[PDB]
């Protein structure tokens, strides 16, 4: 089904019997598993997902300096202090200026100055910890007996997994049963890491990088900021006056550096979901309880024709779609030959045993013809219908 539309693909071929079969999956790609007597099966990822993350830090990356106060003391009488410096949410620096008779003081020694300002954050990057037990996978599967593609949205089956879930049971109505075992022991590492968010664009990041930023930071709810001395700057003093300046939004620098990592996002619906890209997984599958339907039906006899011509697609298989005018609930024979004169097949079907149920019904078929050139052939007798094809 949908695994015909996905851009990049491979097959995988099993061996006869109840053996487990093994696969690996990357977020965009899919795989279709084949086994000699069974109907064929398609699987894909849909996403990795995270829920209920935990807050650990706020890092500040733009700030404003709304109020300033300063005062001075004469070089004989030592240091100075100011009422604002007592309060935790304020910038502070202390230094020595020039002074002298030209400024009304008794000696020409170096003085003392204190400066203080009302700091506040305006936009902050927030960092979250990821609880590695909590990650979720969702997986899509479809048994490839096939139907007109509009049915796919209702026939497709979707599954959930987590590190506590083991092997998982599934059904296909009228075809039997199957089982999956995705090893949650396989993932990229989520230790030593944080999830970073700034304004609905978000990143995985190593804990060391987060610790290494010289930006001001905060321990939790409330509190007072820890190291404003990296972000606020004071210009060298004039005789009784100082100016203090912000370094603006640092944003672009930080935004540049995070390009070295996987991208992350937040969903609009069930907004507790965080949705994550770039990991990969491995799984094994049990096929034994699958069965070929319709084997007891008669071979079709009546005339029939294409509703859409066979066409190419990048995987190398062709696809075609067909209807039947008045046939019974019956099977349609389909095969490929190197010459239209001879019955000895050389090609492989990837949908194994077509069925049409009723006069209204339709079917979708794909084959891999041999490299070279050949005839595709459908039906038998005078109804026989055919098309020419190439590598």
């Amino acid at each position, epitope marked *: 089904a949908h695994c015909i539309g996905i851009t990049d693909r491979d097959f995988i071929e099993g061996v006869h019997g109840g053996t487990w079969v093994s696969a690996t999956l990357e977020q965009d790609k899919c795989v279709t598993v084949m086994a000699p007597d069974k109907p064929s099966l398609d699987i894909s990822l849909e996403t990795v997902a995270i829920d209920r993350p935990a807050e650990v830090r706020k890092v500040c990356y733009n700030a404003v300096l*709304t*109020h300033v*106060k300063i*005062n*001075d*003391k*004469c070089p004989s009488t030592g240091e*100075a*202090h*100011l*009422a604002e410096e007592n309060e935790g949410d304020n910038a502070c620096k202390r230094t020595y200026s020039d*002074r002298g008779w030209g*400024n*009304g*003081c008794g000696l020409f020694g170096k*003085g003392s100055i204190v400066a203080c300002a*009302k700091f506040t954050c305006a936009k902050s990057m927030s960092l979250f910890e990821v609880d590695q037990t909590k990650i979720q996978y969702v997986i899509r599967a479809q048994l490839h007996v096939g139907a007109k593609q509009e049915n796919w949205t209702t026939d497709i089956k979707t599954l959930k997994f987590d590190a506590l879930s083991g092997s998982q049971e599934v059904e296909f109505i009228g075809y039997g049963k199957a089982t999956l075992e995705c090893q949650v022991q396989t993932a990229v590492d989520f230790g030593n890491s944080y999830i970073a968010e700034m304004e609905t664009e978000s990143w995985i990041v190593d804990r060391q990088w987060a610790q290494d930023l010289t930006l001001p930071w905060q321990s939790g709810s409330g509190g007072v900021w820890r190291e404003m001395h990296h972000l606020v700057e004071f210009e060298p003093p004039h005789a*009784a006056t100082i100016r203090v300046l912000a370094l603006g939004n640092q944003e672009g620098s930080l935004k540049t550096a995070l390009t070295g990592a996987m991208r992350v996002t937040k969903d609009t619906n069930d907004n507790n979901l965080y949705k994550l890209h770039g990991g990969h997984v491995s799984c094994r599958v049990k096929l034994s309880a699958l069965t070929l339907k319709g084997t007891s039906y008669k071979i079709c006899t009546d005339k029939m024709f294409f509703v859409k011509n066979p066409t190419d697609t990048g995987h190398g298989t062709v696809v075609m779609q067909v209807k039947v005018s008045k046939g019974a609930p019956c099977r349609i024979p389909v095969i490929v030959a190197d010459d239209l004169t001879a019955a000895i097949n050389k090609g492989i079907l990837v949908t194994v045993n077509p069925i049409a149920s009723t006069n209204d019904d339709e079917v979708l078929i794909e084959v891999n013809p041999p490299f070279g050139d050949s005839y595709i052939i459908v039906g038998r007798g005078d109804s026989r219908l055919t098309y020419q094809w190439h590598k």
Partner: antibody
Amino acid sequence: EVKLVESGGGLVKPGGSLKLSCAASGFTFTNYAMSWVRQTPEKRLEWVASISSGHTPYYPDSVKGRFTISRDNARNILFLQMSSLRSEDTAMYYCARGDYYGSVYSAMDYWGQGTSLTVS
Amino acid sequence: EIRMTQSPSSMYASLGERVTVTCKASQDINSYLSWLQQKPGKSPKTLIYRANRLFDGVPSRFSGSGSGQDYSLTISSLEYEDMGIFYCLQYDEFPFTFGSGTKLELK
């Protein structure tokens, strides 16, 4: 206990000049900042001037270049010198003491008995 | 460049009444604010400064609050020694300024 004492006001001709002189006792005069304020029966108060423990001056624009403030750290006297007096400048005047850091930016919690200066 | 202005420019009361005054400012005062009293023909005196703080020797009956551009002062019970002019005083920017003030009377 703190006490504050006032002197030097009176009547003078326009275009003239005078210096006011406030005397104070009962506290460590080297440390606190202090300021001048003036009032009229017209209720609007006006800030006059303020001075740091570092002798740094501060003034409002309407009197810049006209009024000057200074202090003596041995006599414990505050001197306010005023030049080119006007019919624009006729009021009750007061002096007052700030807080112990000696930084200018704070309110004031002791106030002198005050006296008038007037122009004719 | 700061304006501060006051609403109840002529309100008066009677003994034991709850009374409140309030002021608006042209920009955020960041709590560097204070309240003073002028008695007729005598030196003014303090009551409260900053965020509802009392100086020593001020009786406990005085209180207020405010933030941003909006501020208030109120007394828990009016008594006759309270007769005078209330004034507000702000000191966050070097052109310091007072309000116009208002007079309280017993009826």
